[PDB]
Write a protein that binds this ligand. Structure first.
Ligand SMILES: [Zn+2]
Ligand SMILES: [Zn+2]
Ligand SMILES: [Zn+2]
Length: 86
DNA sequence: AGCGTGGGCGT
DNA sequence: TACGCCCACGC
């Protein structure tokens, strides 16, 4: 069930967890509490800040098992590994 | 390709 | 509640 409803008028979104509603509300408030120290851009989410920072540093923690090519994000690696199929 | 950013959730 | 994985949609 999703007992936690968004109280903003135009919005009919609901959530299973209260913290997910609190995160969602930032969309409506525009709150972007996490600032990149390098370029000063602000982000809604701390995890998205971390991956953004890799655009500046070149850090690529995730290597393809088949070919060893490195990526900044796990989902980016995932999208890549499939190219090695038939 | 590079990468923003919500969806759902384990801890 | 925060932190931060995965997952997913969308340029
Ligand atoms: Zn809402
Ligand atoms: Zn930055
Ligand atoms: Zn590969």
């Amino acid at each position: 069930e999703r007992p936690y409803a968004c109280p903003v008028e135009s919005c009919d979104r609901r959530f299973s967890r209260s913290d997910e509603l609190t995160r969602h509300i930032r969309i409506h408030t525009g709150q972007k509490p996490f600032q990149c120290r390098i370029c000063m851009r602000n982000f809604s989410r701390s995890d998205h800040l971390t991956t953004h920072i890799r655009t500046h540093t070149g850090e690529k923690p995730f290597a393809c098992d088949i070919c060893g090519r490195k990526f900044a994000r796990s989902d980016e690696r995932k999208r890549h590994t499939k190219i090695h199929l038939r």
